[PDB]
Design an enzyme around this catalytic site. Structure first.
Site, PDB file in Angstrom:
ATOM      1  N   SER A  11      -3.519   4.636  11.689  1.00 36.73           N
ATOM      2  CA  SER A  11      -3.871   3.657  10.827  1.00 36.73           C
ATOM      3  C   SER A  11      -2.929   2.371  10.848  1.00 36.73           C
ATOM      4  CB  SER A  11      -3.834   4.263   9.204  1.00 36.73           C
ATOM      5  OG  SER A  11      -2.607   4.451   9.112  1.00 36.73           O
ATOM      6  N   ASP A  31      -9.356   5.475  10.528  1.00 41.94           N
ATOM      7  CA  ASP A  31      -8.220   5.018  11.250  1.00 41.94           C
ATOM      8  C   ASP A  31      -8.826   4.847  12.940  1.00 41.94           C
ATOM      9  OD1 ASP A  31      -8.116   7.838  12.533  1.00 41.94           O
ATOM     10  OD2 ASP A  31      -6.155   8.381  11.458  1.00 41.94           O
ATOM     11  N   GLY A  38      -4.630  -1.816  11.412  1.00 47.51           N
ATOM     12  CA  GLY A  38      -5.269  -0.551  11.956  1.00 47.51           C
ATOM     13  C   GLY A  38      -6.082   0.278  10.929  1.00 47.51           C
ATOM     14  N   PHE A  73       0.786  -1.246   0.058  1.00 48.94           N
ATOM     15  CA  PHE A  73      -0.103  -0.055   0.193  1.00 48.94           C
ATOM     16  C   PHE A  73       0.708   1.378   0.107  1.00 48.94           C
ATOM     17  CE2 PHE A  73      -4.028  -2.058   2.196  1.00 48.94           C
ATOM     18  CZ  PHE A  73      -4.180  -2.787   1.028  1.00 48.94           C
ATOM     19  N   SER A  97      -8.656  -0.560   7.236  1.00 55.41           N
ATOM     20  CA  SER A  97      -8.896  -1.432   6.290  1.00 55.41           C
ATOM     21  C   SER A  97     -10.358  -1.238   5.743  1.00 55.41           C
ATOM     22  CB  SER A  97      -8.740  -3.104   6.791  1.00 55.41           C
ATOM     23  OG  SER A  97      -9.869  -3.163   7.742  1.00 55.41           O
ATOM     24  N   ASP A  99     -10.853  12.535  15.459  1.00 57.69           N
ATOM     25  CA  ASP A  99     -10.106  12.780  16.707  1.00 57.69           C
ATOM     26  C   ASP A  99     -10.834  13.901  17.344  1.00 57.69           C
ATOM     27  OD1 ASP A  99      -8.121  11.009  18.004  1.00 57.69           O
ATOM     28  OD2 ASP A  99      -6.758  11.295  16.316  1.00 57.69           O
ATOM     29  N   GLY A 130      -8.125  17.163  11.638  1.00 59.98           N
ATOM     30  CA  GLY A 130      -8.540  15.727  11.664  1.00 59.98           C
ATOM     31  C   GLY A 130      -9.733  15.417  12.612  1.00 59.98           C
ATOM     32  N   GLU A 184      -6.775  18.633  15.865  1.00 57.90           N
ATOM     33  CA  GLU A 184      -7.830  17.394  15.886  1.00 57.90           C
ATOM     34  C   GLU A 184      -7.999  17.286  17.657  1.00 57.90           C
ATOM     35  OE1 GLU A 184      -4.149  14.150  15.412  1.00 57.90           O
ATOM     36  OE2 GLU A 184      -6.248  13.715  14.468  1.00 57.90           O
ATOM     37  N   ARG A 243       6.156  -2.968  -8.727  1.00 52.01           N
ATOM     38  CA  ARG A 243       6.369  -3.863  -7.650  1.00 52.01           C
ATOM     39  C   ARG A 243       7.587  -2.942  -6.848  1.00 52.01           C
ATOM     40  NH1 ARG A 243       6.944  -9.720  -6.092  1.00 52.01           N
ATOM     41  NH2 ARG A 243       5.565 -10.120  -8.175  1.00 52.01           N
ATOM     42  N   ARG A 260       3.826  10.258   9.293  1.00 52.91           N
ATOM     43  CA  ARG A 260       3.135  10.889  10.596  1.00 52.91           C
ATOM     44  C   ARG A 260       3.666   9.853  11.610  1.00 52.91           C
ATOM     45  NH1 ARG A 260      -3.553  11.515  11.633  1.00 52.91           N
ATOM     46  NH2 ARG A 260      -3.442   9.191  11.071  1.00 52.91           N
TER      47      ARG A 260
HETATM   48  O1  LIG Z   1      -9.600  12.599  11.983  1.00 56.47           O
HETATM   49  C1  LIG Z   1      -8.651  12.046  12.437  1.00 56.47           C
HETATM   50  O2  LIG Z   1      -8.501  11.950  13.752  1.00 56.47           O
HETATM   51  C2  LIG Z   1      -7.230  11.701  11.711  1.00 56.47           C
HETATM   52  O3  LIG Z   1      -6.182  11.432  12.007  1.00 56.47           O
HETATM   53  C3  LIG Z   1      -7.543  11.667  10.274  1.00 56.47           C
HETATM   54  C4  LIG Z   1      -8.372  10.360   9.865  1.00 56.47           C
HETATM   55  O4  LIG Z   1      -7.707   9.594   8.796  1.00 56.47           O
HETATM   56  C5  LIG Z   1      -8.383   8.285   8.597  1.00 56.47           C
HETATM   57  O5  LIG Z   1      -9.524   7.938   8.888  1.00 56.47           O
HETATM   58  C6  LIG Z   1      -7.473   7.397   7.844  1.00 56.47           C
HETATM   59  C7  LIG Z   1      -7.825   6.376   7.075  1.00 56.47           C
HETATM   60  C8  LIG Z   1      -6.916   5.437   6.013  1.00 56.47           C
HETATM   61  C9  LIG Z   1      -5.850   6.330   6.572  1.00 56.47           C
HETATM   62  S1  LIG Z   1      -5.702   7.695   7.771  1.00 56.47           S
HETATM   63 MG   LIG Z   2      -6.510  11.688  14.156  1.00 58.26          MG
END
Ligand SMILES: O=C(O)C(=O)/C=C/OC(=O)c1cccs1
Ligand SMILES: [Mg+2]
Ligand SMILES: [Mg+2]
Ligand SMILES: [Mg+2]
Length: 714
Positions: free
Chosen positions: A274, A620, A605, A125, A607, A449, A446, A421, A301, A328
């Site tokens: 994640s 996430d 973490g 990924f 999917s 969070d 974010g 966030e 690849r 991150r």
């Molecule tokens: O909003 C938050 O707290 C934050 O950190 C961003 C959220 O990202 C995710 O949901 C992801 C899904 C796949 C990779 S990141």
């Molecule tokens: Mg977050």
């Protein structure tokens, strides 16, 4: 033990070896001096790290107490603000200023476009993400529901020409809308030629050039029968591939094979929410992928090379083939046993990440095997999540400063992407930016969070609205505008990114293309996407919206008040019928179980997790923070009983089991609930939710995953 002694530190052998054998060679940092640096940075900064965490606790206890001692139903905002100010939660706003961050790449300072976030633990990924800088629009349209699967246009096991023609038409319209012809439509093009450094499009009856010839960026092959034509719009490239002999080009009136969009301009390689990493072995897997990415040699690849073009005048040039990478790191809270001190206490993981991801990123500032992979301007880009207020931002900057010294890097090499966030960052955002004024390269809402923190902070105030209602509450709409306002006022336009949050519904791409346009329309120079496919589709929005112009028009505007930011999402009286309560309870229990079972049992973490109505979500760990806090909140205030919770968990578990039927490694939670560590983890997150620091899920989740690993070892 198997650990290595360095001063007061005892380092897991697997980590010690990885760093000495893989991360250090080629950096010219003296290994012993590196390790002495680690010991000293950890010794020096650990106390302040802990003081900051204790400060979160003191503040939360005071707010908890404030709500408990009062009976007056409509909240008095003047009293509430005065209180928050008195205790040092709400700090004074600093005078206007402009950020001074320099040595930053164009993808960040100037280009507006999608930002892709992927788990660093999944090498394939990560590789796809790095390569996602360019992506096929035809594949993105044909493969998703952006072109509706109506009667006659459904996807089969083989090529549906009816569906394919709709793809082509959608793309032709995008071209007319983005790079308009002087006359006529791309729909009627019969060919492309370059004459006197000018693009000539053949129509049935005539020829024409572009309304704006400056959008012609280049081509490949011979000017008189090019193999591709390169265009540019709002700083983003579009490439028309010409090949009549392709299975799609054969059907096409101009022999067009595909339209390629510059898509994921930047990518964030994620070590935080994640991924599931709870010990030294997990961290090393992550670091080794991050190293492979920076050295350009990761193969699962391989990494793409830069793209060669002929300029319109006839000369040669090159465009980057790879997404510019951020990493991150984890935030200030958790410790990890990858390193312990003499007393056996675990070292702060955020401090470790800064040292190791930063060391590793040095390889991305130099030639691979090929030209250097990442920052040509010499910056290292680190996203720092879950900070609460300006002193925590200052602490992160000082950490970066000390790491820069250990690594022999010039001060301010390590840039910071600030996640907005947490509530105490939101209401002190201008001060947080100021604290990092010479390092900041983005701010980003974010929102997941942030919602979790909103619930926990006002846990004692009363029952909160339902999870689906949160996205439209006054606090969150104000939070989003306040974020943009703060960035623009700090001079982010032309200097740093103003970013918005993740689109989580991976299969609902028609919906994404329809609604996510709101984000650049709100002046965001970037927003998060979960896949290269979504990056390509989200790129469409930046062609439709001129973000630079939007930001200019927003300048000087103050569109959110402190009172709006502080409007707690308390439910109104008699908000819900009994069936509505039960559906919300089931919704949240299913969300918790669905995520937790993959995390604890398989160490995954992020999917595509089906929700209660079978909608695929990729979220996430913050989604877990929200649901567990909301249920803890409802339990705390008598909306539901402990029996309601247990009944819903028991009801939702078999459903989650069924949703994972297509998985060789899955093991069901039902009906032996108490034998399932994942089920007990889900239960613990709810019943102990109110007691977790700021509602954070990691202490419980990490313990349970470690428990699972240890059981699996027998
Ligand atoms: O909003 C938050 O707290 C934050 O950190 C961003 C959220 O990202 C995710 O949901 C992801 C899904 C796949 C990779 S990141
Ligand atoms: Mg977050
Ligand atoms: Mg509601
Ligand atoms: Mg325009």
């Amino acid at each position: 033990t198997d650990r290595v002694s360095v001063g007061n530190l005892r380092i897991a052998r697997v980590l010690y070896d990885f760093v000495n054998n893989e991360a250090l060679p080629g950096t010219d940092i003296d290994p012993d001096s590196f390790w002495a640096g680690v010991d000293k940075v950890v010794a020096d900064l650990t106390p302040q790290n802990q003081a900051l965490l204790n400060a979160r606790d003191e503040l939360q206890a005071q707010i908890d107490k404030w709500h408990r001692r009062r009976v007056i139903e409509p909240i008095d905002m003047d009293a509430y603000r005065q209180f928050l100010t008195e205790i040092g939660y709400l700090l004074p706003e600093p005078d206007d200023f402009t950020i001074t961050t320099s040595g930053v790449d164009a993808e960040i300072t100037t280009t507006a476009g999608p930002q892709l976030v992927v788990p660093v633990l999944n090498a394939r990924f990560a590789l796809n993400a790095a390569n996602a800088r360019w992506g096929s629009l035809y594949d993105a349209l044909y493969g998703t529901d952006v072109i509706p699967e109506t009667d006659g246009a459904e996807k089969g096991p083989t090529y549906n020409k009816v569906r394919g023609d709709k793809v082509i038409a959608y793309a032709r319209k995008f071209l007319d809308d983005s790079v308009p012809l002087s006359s006529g439509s791309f729909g009627d093009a019969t060919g492309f030629t370059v004459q006197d450094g000018q693009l000539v499009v053949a129509l049935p009856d005539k020829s024409t050039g572009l309304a704006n010839p400056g959008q012609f960026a280049g081509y490949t092959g011979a000017a008189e029968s090019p193999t591709s034509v390169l265009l540019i719009n709002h700083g983003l490239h579009i490439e028309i591939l010409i090949d009549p002999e392709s299975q799609v080009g054969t059907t096409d009136r101009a022999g067009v094979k595909d339209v390629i969009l510059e898509s994921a301009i930047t990518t964030i390689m994620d070590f935080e929410d994640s991924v599931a990493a709870v010990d030294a072995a997990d961290k090393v897997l992550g670091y080794r992928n991050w190293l492979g990415l920076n050295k350009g040699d990761l193969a699962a690849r391989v990494l793409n090379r830069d793209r060669n073009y002929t300029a319109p005048g006839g000369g040669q040039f090159t465009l980057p083939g790879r997404s510019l990478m951020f990493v991150r790191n984890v935030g200030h809270l958790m410790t990890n046993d990858a390193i312990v001190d003499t007393d056996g206490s675990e070292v702060f993981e955020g401090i470790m990440d800064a040292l190791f991801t930063g060391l590793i990123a040095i390889h991305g500032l130099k030639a691979s095997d090929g030209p250097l992979i990442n920052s040509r301007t010499g910056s290292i880009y680190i996203v720092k999540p879950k900070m609460h207020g300006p002193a925590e931002v200052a602490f992160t900057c000082e950490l970066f400063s000390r790491v820069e010294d250990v690594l022999g890097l010039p001060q301010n090499t390590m840039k910071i992407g600030i996640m907005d966030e947490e509530r105490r960052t939101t209401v002190n955002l201008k001060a947080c930016i100021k604290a990092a004024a010479d390092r900041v390269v983005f701010i980003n809402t974010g929102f997941l969070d942030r919602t979790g923190d909103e619930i926990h902070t006002s846990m004692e105030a009363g029952p909160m609205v339902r999870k689906g209602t949160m996205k439209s509450q006054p606090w969150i709409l104000a939070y989003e505008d306040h974020n943009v306002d703060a960035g623009l006022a700090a001079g982010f336009s032309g200097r740093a990114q103003v970013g918005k949050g993740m689109w989580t519904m991976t299969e609902l791409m028609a919906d994404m293309v329809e609604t996510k346009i709101a984000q650049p329309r709100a002046g965001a120079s970037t927003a998060w996407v979960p896949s290269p496919t979504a990056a390509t589709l989200h790129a469409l929005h930046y062609h439709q919206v001129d973000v630079a112009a939007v930001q200019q028009g927003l300048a000087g505007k103050r569109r959110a008040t402190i009172e709006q930011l502080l409007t707690i999402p308390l439910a109104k009286e008699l908000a819900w019928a009994p069936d509505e309560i039960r559906e919300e309870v089931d919704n949240n229990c299913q969300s918790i179980l669905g995520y937790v079972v993959r995390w604890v049992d398989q160490g995954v973490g992020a999917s595509k997790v089906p929700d209660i109505h079978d909608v695929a979500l990729m979220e996430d760990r913050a989604t877990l923070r929200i649901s567990s806090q909301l249920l803890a909140n409802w339990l705390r205030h008598g909306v539901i009983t402990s029996a309601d919770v247990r009944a819903s968990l028991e009801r939702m578990a078999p459903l989650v089991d069924r949703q994972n039927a297509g998985d060789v490694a899955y093991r069901p939670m039902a009906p032996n609930f108490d034998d399932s560590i994942a089920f007990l983890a889900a239960q613990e997150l709810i019943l102990s939710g109110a007691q977790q620091p700021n509602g954070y899920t990691e202490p419980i989740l990490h313990r349970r995953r470690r428990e699972f690993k240890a059981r699996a070892a027998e």
